[PDB]
């Protein structure tokens, strides 16, 4: 990252890259430990689009760098359409956020970027990292995730909370969908255990807290 | 590595932690994972490597079955490079046994610590192209006829295999592009073959063809 | 053609049209004999787009004048995207090449085209003629053409250079594919016979000329 | 060809090319009719190696121009090993015969070759034309061609002189093999009919003319 009297760009150490690879390989790219570590890296530095490529290339499988680059390209193609419709329109084109082109293809040209382009490339890079799949799997639809027999209830809810995180982009639309689907796809035991509790949050609680509290020793 | 303080050049062996990190990286992730490539480039470009140190680094990091392949492709690379040092004007004075580190003039560390940079860069390029050909610890290099996206397999896991095969076999990158962009459609399953076919041969703006190809048949897991 | 001794449109002779239909019907529209015959008419005359209408209609099957008109129309849609996007932009629109419209729909209007336009229509009709299929077949894919057992080797490579000419437009990209696929799709018997000769062209030779040398007696 | 009335390169006529393709397609590239027709063009003109490019491309199958270019290239690699190893050495390198390179890659450079070079290219293209296969077959071995039962005898010997012309280059070595194999690979019925006539040619005759005399009525 770059350090603010002029712009000086220094690569990462070996320890940071070793920790990132050892995290991604063992726990997954979207385990909560990796999200916490990645947000601590990104919010605590000044990342140019060179550094997202250096970080993601040296940490991900080659089957996952393709997905990272693809959803980065999709995110900047949608962010450009909201950038020209401004009043005044901002001078943030596609080739300034992708880190390629004629005027933006070397680290000396990129190190003189403003705060708004930094905070705009950060959100689309994080949303790109949020969509990277696990090595052997594909993202399923909501018709497939059902609590099978002999399976705990929070293990069932924590699959829905991830499926609704890869697909749907708005959090308010995530909450209503997972609150609805937590009752329809449940086992008959947890459905009968959860039916007298529906639509009743007592005080300062989440709905799914009382839901997982309700059916508790049911499966096993 | 070796270092130069000027009128003389001194030698020092590798660290005790560096070889440990290299062995853990090669054993757990692979010899040609993208992490080990940047680690090896950071070691090579930031130091001065004589072929003695290349043999020490490759001996203490690879399998007993992988040092054979590294030595074989090192020998083949020097055999192909010598034929471009005698067909030059002026003829470049780098024979076979200056690159391989053998012989009578080039068999000790004090004999090898006096090399010039036009041979250091050559042995660096040959050693890196040799390391790019070492296989995984149980497999042989397949041909392009066999890499096919089977049913119930995601799409980018197939393009990753195609790019690995094209990196191991073909030595020209401009030819590496135009073969994998064609084979990425002829070897897909019928569902991605139906999904790519509307968008075939059209780039919108400033992207790679695979970036729209993986975007097209995204959720093929039903 | 049109002759300038200042314009004079002369029709085709009865003997020239008799030899084109007799040649197309017996050898094919893309035999090497018809390729040199068609160039001696094109490069030796002044063909307006009204004359490619008469020459192709009176020489091709009714199922092949449909394919010749398709890839003619599709070829102008890419020529205008290299006509206006150049500096300076040239006045070559769509309906000047296709020979339709209001200003380009008679002999007396098309008889005064310039040599920038005559040379551009002549290079896209000849690219349309390279895609006209045989009278009963469709263009196969690259992974389908394999050397069958008890089939001679130069008959296999002759098929390989035909699939790689209807599909790929760049002649450099043909060169890297038809040499690569010549060993991989081959027979098991030649694959043990080409492999010692692989990738070592000695002096003043082609790659495949050294390959057909090695399977000189592979028929049983 | 080139005419000297001091150089003038004239292209081929439209009627000469029409008869070569009509002849090759119907009878074969190595019928006795095409052998005398090709010699009347070669021995009656001045063919530069640019003209063997046009004549063979506009007359052969695409699978047969690959074989014509292979044995042309292979034939120059043996001519240079009889060019420099003679006393005195002649200035006939590889890229003068093949018509490639920098000094031999246009019409105006090749129009001034000498009659030592014109006569040497003319004897190796004509040897390349003797090896071009039929449009669906490969060259069989000598122990495969046997006279089948209920097959006429001169049709068997006509096959024997065709295998012994693509394989063996020395015309004296053809003579001792096609006469020896004419009795050994023959039918049981002619083998009892040729054996009293064996090895006794009376006066002013060929060996096989006395052999086809003896199987005049062997068809059943």
Author numbering:
A (entry chain H): 1 to 4, 21 to 236
B (entry chain G): 1 to 6, 21 to 236
C (entry chain I), D (entry chain I): 1 to 5, 22 to 236
Published text:
The D5 particle is an elongated or capsular expansion of the T = 1 particle with polar regions identical to T = 1, but containing five equatorially inserted distorted hexamers, consistent with local two-fold (dihedral) symmetry. Moreover, adaptation of hexamers to the local environment is also a feature of our other D5 and D6 capsular assemblies, where hexamers interact with each other in the equatorial belt. Again, the pentamer conformation remains invariant and the hexamer six-fold symmetry is broken by NTD domain movements, changes in the NTD–CTD linker conformation and in the intra-hexamer CTD–NTD hydrogen bonding configuration and in the CTD radial position when interacting with either a neighbouring pentamer or hexamer. In the D5 and D6 particles, further configurations are possible depending on whether pentamers and hexamers are located at poles or are equatorial and interact either longitudinally or laterally. Nevertheless, all hexamer–pentamer interfaces still fall into group 2 and all hexamer–hexamer interfaces still fall into group 3, albeit in D6, the α8 displacement for the equatorial hexamer–hexamer interactions are larger than in D5, due to the lower curvature of the equatorial region. Exceptions were the N-terminal β-hairpin that contains a large loop insertion and is more mobile than in the crystal structure, and the NTD–CTD linker region of D5 and D6 equatorial hexamers that displayed weaker density.
